[PDB]
Amino acid sequence: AVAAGPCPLREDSFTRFSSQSNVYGLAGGGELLAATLKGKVLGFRYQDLRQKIRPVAKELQFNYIPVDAEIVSIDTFNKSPPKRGLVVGITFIKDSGDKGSPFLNIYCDGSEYNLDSIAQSCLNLELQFTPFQLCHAEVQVGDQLETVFLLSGNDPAIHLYKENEGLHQFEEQPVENLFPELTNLTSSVLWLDVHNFPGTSRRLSALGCQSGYVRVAHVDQRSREVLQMWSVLQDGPISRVIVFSLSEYSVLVASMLEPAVVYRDLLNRGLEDQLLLPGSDQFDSVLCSLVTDVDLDGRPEVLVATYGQELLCYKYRGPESGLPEAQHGFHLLWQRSFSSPLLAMAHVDLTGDGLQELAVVSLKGVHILQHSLIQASELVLTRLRHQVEQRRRRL
Template identity: 35%
Template sequence: MKEETEDPKQAVIQELAECKAKNNLNFVNAHFFCLPSQGNVYTLTPLTDAKGFTKILVASLQRKVYCLEYTNGRPCMRDVPFTYIPGGAEIISIDAVNRSIIQEDFIIGITIIKKDDTTGQQSHFFNIYSDWDLNSDSALDVVSQNCLPLELDFVPYHLYHTKALGKKGWETVWLLSGSDSIIHLYQSDDESHSYQEVDGSQSFPEFRSVDGITLWMDILYTQEDKRRVTVTCGEGGNVHMFQVNVKSSPEVISSRCISWDYPVSSAKIFSSTNFVRTPLFLQDILRLQKQDSPRKDEDKLSIVVGTTLESCFVYRDFANVGKGFRLPESGANDAVTCCIVCDIDQDGNNEILIGTYGQAVLVYKWIQKTSEWILYHTVSLPCPVLSLAYCDVMGDGTFQLIVMTSTGIHILQHDPWEMAKVLLHRIEAFMEPRMDNLHKNEPAQDLAQDTADNEAIDNNT
């Protein structure tokens, strides 16, 4: 008899049903915060403090910056009074990072455009806010008053922070794309307590090959910071992918360019499996026990590319194979505005979230049986989506989906009952092998105890 072959479509349907049965993506619309004016794709950034609590900084086009945070379980949206943002100025982009893991060392960058009412000419500025005195209370309100304004001779676009190897070791640097088709590098000068633009051709040689206006960039360091992967995409439709060997003199070891006939709005580097970095104190214990710290599969990184007029594509293992996978229905909801990659259903594998101007967030999942991406879930919003983030802003130990639309901020929370089931399941899976080992050792322990008791009786006799 001839064996029946499994229908690929049925395999997809079956695996999709199994995934949804294990991890339900029911979201609760926890809170909504209205903005007085619209932002853009560059005006939302998470900021995590030393205690692990995450704030959301969001800027509106009309010079206002707001901080969304939860205090004692209660949401609060407040205006942060950043200095050197004059009336009539328009905020283009914002980015923020805490450079310390033991204290508050916030550094915030804001790019603005100011128009002169009399002449009609525009001036552009890159404002960097930080507190150089680390012994003081570097709270957000304090940092917002310490500004270093840098005047620009180009229109700013994407503002991005990363790390670079300098003379004194690793340091946080700013990358800013501009209308002059250059990605500018800004480094700190501790002696003068200021920031200045430096030549980035040595630290970031991959940017020499970038042409056209860069609309988005992403950087990921791998192999214990010995290599980095960089992707840029832009207005001209070119997507540049690089692998860089990070040494005292970094060099590009491989590159690839994909050209589209229309602008590419976003790109993201990711690994297929979710990875939580081992804390420093556990790394020391693993070294003493001569165990290797778990690492993600860094040699098979993928890149998702979001286009403005066509479907999005995922290039899996782009450095070796580079096969492209189309994300189905990703071009049916107007232009793609943003994308993030995260394990949103808590199964250990990362999903792709695409934000669209068509008022929808599309969730895509990789199906191993048929080797394809499928549309897993759709979140409908009342307005166009501009930016996405996935972080623990509520401080309850679970992540929330942060969606910025043209009217405000939506906080989408996972169903607490579903999260409780996931937590209990993981605790049971964690304890099961330990209980099995305990039961296996019980007879030997009982025998050893009986032998010890008999020896004690003989000695007493």
């Protein structure tokens, strides 16, 4: 419950938000898109100038959204590698007098990658249920990879909206056709991850629902056959689930009333090997999470954003330095602090150098954190010098 080392992150800029967002507000792009509840959407980027850079946060407008409409979720992706362009999906709710009127807008336009052109290409589609999360996945149909939308609904069902070149439009299709594991749901699904495998026809699918039911499925794609299945009933809503390779595969479950945990060796031990992240429950409710290498050591670490304005970062030890009883578990690497509840993160190279900035969307706005440049300037030089020396010794 004690940090080991200081935070190597230095905050660069901070753009204030007039109105708050929600956990589904953060989108991708090397630009960035973030939308507020009241329909104001902003594009974040950086512009170079002589020997420095400057953040730019430019508001954007989409054609067919009512001024009274309230935006619920947003996402986007790039077209399939055979194709070209980007597609942006936004789900809002009209206020039909005293009822909700859900909807879904899909924007996709040379100008296939031009965001300004894509700003007005939408299609208006009813939803008949209150949407929860707009995500997307890539599937192997025939011998071609195709990217399709996914959207959890008020009725415990996931509704796929596939593109069609014949009509050049997105139409709803049954989810059982492509995703056998995404059927027969009891509670609404807050978060859902589809982890493809590299180069094979297999993959994993992880999902958690409001009641705390978490289902993980090892699913093929060529035969569309579920191989195995595991499920666990926890307490409290499942805020986040991420499928990641620790070094073999493992998963991370971030609840809202219990310490976040990681289940190891899914394909070899099911869901019986559990490691809890110590002390990650003393800071209110874990609203977000992200798994990547923040230590620049070539091995991933776990980021946990709490409602109590905390940004804990946990590091895995590793059997390579296995220490008997205190075995290769998890320990608190370091801990930062903020002033607003934390909602979403992103790990994107906005500057344009190869170093990855961390964008954090909180209640009042967006913080662009960078690595400590002084630390990230001597370390690269030492690595390069060692590389040259070993090359000479090996020459």
